Structure formats: C-alpha cells, structure tokens
Amino acid sequence: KKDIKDIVNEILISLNINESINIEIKPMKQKIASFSFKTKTLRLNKYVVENFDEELLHYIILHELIHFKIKSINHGIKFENELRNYFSKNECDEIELKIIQKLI
Amino acid sequence: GPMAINENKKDIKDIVNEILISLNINESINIEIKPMKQKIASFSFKTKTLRLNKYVVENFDEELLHYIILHELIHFKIKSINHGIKFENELRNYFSKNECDEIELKIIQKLI
C-alpha cells in the first residue's frame, strides 16, 4: 500500500544518510536490486516492488543503502551492525528464507 | 599473481541428470531454460517441466545451480509443493540447515 519511493526515503533518513540519490523502478532481467556508487543510483526490480511483501522490500532496500552508508561492497561486521538496528539475526533468517521461497 | 583457470562450466543438462540419479527419479521431465520475470526456477507437476531462468543458468556457479535444481526436484520426488518434514528429510541427505542458509545467502547476494 505504501509507495515504494516513500519507503526508500524513510530508510535514507532512518539510516542518517545525508547524500542524495537517484531511485529507478524498472524491469530488471539480471537483478532484484542494485546500487551504483558512480551515479548514486538505487535500482529496484519493478516486479519485486509490485509483488513482494513490505518487510522483504525493507530488507532489500536496507542491504543496498547500508552499502552506500558504510562505503563498502562487503557484508561483514560493519554491514551487520547497521542491519541489526532494524532486524535481529533470527528476523534476517526468516526474511532470507521468505525471499528464497519467492525465487525457487 | 596469475589467475587460477576458471574450470569448465558443467552443462546444465548434466547437473539436472546427476540430481535425478542421486534422488532416484526415473520419471521423465522437460527442461526449459528461458527468461523468467517472476522466478529464477519453478517446477510444474502438470507438464513435469523444470523451468530455469536463462540469465541465472548462464551466470551462476555450479554450487548455486545444483542447490536450485535440487530444491525443485525434491518437490517432484516427494509429490508435494510444500516444505514439510518429508522435504527436509530429502534435503538433509545433501546439506545441513547451516549449509542451506549459506548457499541461500549466496543466491540472494547474486541478486541484491
């Protein structure tokens, strides 16, 4: 029900990001979501945006915007500490299983 | 340093046949590798068709392709679209819960 750009904007602010980005919602044949550090563009797969539950979208957007905040493409302790401000390890396990069950 | 030679990609049909053998499935299946917008893999009981996303088949490592195909073919073996204890029983002959979480995270992080 909540517009996808409103969700992205809420996450940019809750992550305390103060660098403007571009948001593109488009069909994507190779990915669900991506972030270009060169053009500061967040790309979200249109089908996923229109068909995945809000919590899965939250997790997906957080993944990309945490990379942008910490200026790292890796998923170690700096990434994990940012994600833990939103979802516990057990909550991430449940979301990750739900995303897989939507793909296969 | 010199890059270690990226080993010859196993043909998708060979990955499928190895799983049908290990799962002891002698029912015939159709394999469709096509662009898919909604999923990366599916299985139709109506036509006995394993559907695989074309970009995924051409770019994912063997370990991820094996896991994805194994998931669909376990459903076909147990004659259930669900992930009950009968699904877990077949999957556990291949991977522990921790190993499944690891591979599933690699799949997710190929797409996000």
Ligand SMILES: [Cl-]
């Ligand atoms: Cl694309």
Ligand SMILES: [Cl-]
């Ligand atoms: Cl980039």
Ligand SMILES: [Cl-]
């Ligand atoms: Cl283990």
Ligand SMILES: [Zn+2]
């Ligand atoms: Zn990432």
Ligand SMILES: [Zn+2]
């Ligand atoms: Zn399934």
